[PDB]
Amino acid sequence: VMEKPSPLLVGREFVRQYYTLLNQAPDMLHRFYGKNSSYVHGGLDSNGKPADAVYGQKEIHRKVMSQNFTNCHTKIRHVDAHATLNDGVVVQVMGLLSNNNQALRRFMQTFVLAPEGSVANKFYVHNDIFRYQDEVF
């Protein structure tokens, strides 16, 4: 009978794996998510406010591939991870992201990681909220 991991360790390790996967195989990113996961990654509606959110692995994959991630580079400047409801981990990431060798843009992201349930110490992404500062401020 082992011990459950600390929230900081889970959040840091997840941030690592998430952004390396975003850079190396973004078409794989959907594998982080479940049937009931929410996902938004910035975006601005035409003459409208920030974009809305899609749900579930298939729609999340569709959105990710429509975002056309190429040579994604991420500079992480801050990560918080705290225990939350039913052994979850809430994570707040502050950093810079550049897609397709374009502008290095400041962003804020909120993750909620939940236990996958079947495999010990496995987590999936229940919530993924990403916003660029230059689309808000």
Binding site: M2, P5, L9, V10, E13, F14, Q17, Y18, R31, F32, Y33, G34, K35, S37, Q57, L113, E116, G117, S118, V119, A120, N121, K122, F123, Y124, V125
Partner: peptide, 11 residues
């Protein structure tokens, strides 16, 4: 112990 892993439940 097991290592920490990440991934959906595959349901």
């Amino acid at each position: 112990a097991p290592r920490i892993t990440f991934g959906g439940p595959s349901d």
